[PDB]
């Protein structure tokens, strides 16, 4: 269901930005086909297709646009198997490699630190993160976007009173409507903290567009 939500609401960079570089592949260790290795080790012919189905399923969970083109076995693991998987993304010509561990039902696992790039936010997380950025941005901070932002700094140092809590709640409702069409605010609760009398806690509850 996460794929359905991601397609409807979109994907984008996660906030705050994060960067990863995957571990280096020891290419001088994978020079033997997995299918030829399995057949040579007198493995069952029916076991091979179950072996390949496990690889494809595990890779698909890792990246569902993948299309497996090659499979090799590390020479330092001759019956815990280390596998280098080669795939292509969709119909593109871009090829990528990924390490894995095969265990003989067969089990296949992916190395934990293998992806290189940014972290992405999908579906509900994208919308939740989007509202968070709006709260933390004040108008005039974005270049050529001088109106974008919530602007809750204007209500600081005001006396904590029913007028202030009403102003804060209505301000949030108007700004989210203007700058976040994918979300709908269903409740706003403003309370004064007992241990810290000078701080206000705001509880915001949101629902997705067309979720029901």
């Amino acid at each position: 269901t996460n794929k359905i939500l991601a397609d409807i609401y979109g994907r984008g960079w996660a906030f705050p930005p994060q960067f990863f570089i995957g571990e280096r592949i020891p290419y001088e260790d994978y020079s033997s086909d997995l299918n030829k290795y399995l057949s040579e080790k007198k493995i069952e012919a029916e076991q091979i297709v179950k072996i390949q189905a496990c690889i494809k399923e595990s890779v698909m969970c890792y990246d569902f646009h993948a299309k497996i083109t090659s499979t090799q076995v590390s020479k330092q693991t001759n019956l815990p198997l280390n596998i280098l998987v080669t795939y292509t993304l969709g119909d593109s010509e871009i090829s990528q490699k990924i390490q894995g561990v095969l265990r003989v039902p067969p089990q296949f696992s992916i190395k934990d630190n293998s992806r290189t790039g940014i972290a992405i936010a999908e579906g509900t997380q994208n919308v939740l993160q989007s509202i968070n950025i709006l709260f933390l941005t004040e108008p005039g901070e974005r270049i050529m976007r001088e109106d974008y932002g919530c602007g809750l700094n204007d209500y600081l140092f005001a006396n904590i009173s029913d007028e202030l809590m009403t102003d804060i709640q209505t301000h949030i409702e108007e700004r989210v409507l203007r700058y976040e069409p994918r979300a709908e605010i269903t409740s706003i609760q403003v309370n004064q903290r007992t241990n810290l009398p000078s701080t206000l806690h705001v509880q915001v509850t949101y629902a997705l567009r067309g979720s029901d």
Partner: protein, 224 residues
């Protein structure tokens, strides 16, 4: 109340543009009005047919919502030190034609916890302003005057667009429960959509293998 018992005051704010991104000024009423009226009207046209005996009327453009207030300004009793003419000058200037846009300013009315039909503010433009002077000093300084104010609703285009797509989403999502059929799912999913959806179109969009290819707890999507 919850914390204190301060008396909230009614405020009038003016902007040059519809989206309220260029403020012009503001005025806080010295006396809150004791009555506020909101008016909604909508017009229909009767359907005339030469071969049908049905009785029906179809919708025609509804006039914008109206709002009416009466404000009182006094400068004679103790504690009232702001001159009446200053307040009346500010009030009229906010309701007047802007020298740059050549159109009257866009106004916002805010007052405490009062909600003007689901919003904390009434967005509109002045359509009438009558002022009666009833008391003067010996040097003709006005001491008491009442202004009758009436506006017509004129909302922002961005807020209207967001609310439109919120209640009529381009794509809707549903959850499958026990003993549901595809025509039943399409009715529930297609209720919010502008044009509804048929069971064949709903099946095709979700890539169903057959008309019963779903299980309870699964989620389905429906587009326009």
């Amino acid at each position: 109340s919850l914390i204190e018992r301060g008396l909230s005051k009614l405020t009038l704010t003016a902007f040059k543009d519809r989206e309220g991104k260029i403020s012009v000024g503001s005025l806080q009423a010295m006396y809150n009005p004791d009555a506020i009226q909101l008016d909604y009207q909508t017009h229909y046209q009767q359907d005339e047919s030469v071969n049908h005996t049905r009785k029906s009327s179809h919708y025609v453009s509804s006039p914008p919502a109206g709002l009416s207030l009466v404000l009182l300004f006094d400068a004679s009793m103790p504690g009232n030190n702001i001159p009446v003419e200053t307040q009346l000058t500010t009030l009229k200037a906010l309701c007047a034609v802007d020298p740059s846009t050549h159109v009257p300013h866009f106004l916002k009315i805010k007052w405490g916890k009062m909600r003007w039909e689901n919003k904390s503010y009434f967005a509109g433009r002045a359509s009438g302003l009558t002022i009666n002077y009833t008391l003067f000093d010996r040097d003709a300084t006005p001491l008491r005057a009442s202004a009758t104010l009436s506006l017509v609703a004129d909302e922002s285009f961005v807020i209207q667009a967001t609310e439109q797509q919120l209640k009529s989403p381009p794509v809707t999502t549903v959850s499958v429960t026990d003993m549901l059929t595809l025509p039943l799912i399409a009715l529930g999913a297609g209720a919010s959509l502008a044009s509804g959806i048929d069971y064949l179109s709903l099946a095709w969009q979700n890539d169903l293998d057959n008309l019963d290819d779903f299980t309870p707890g699964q989620t389905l999507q429906a587009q326009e």
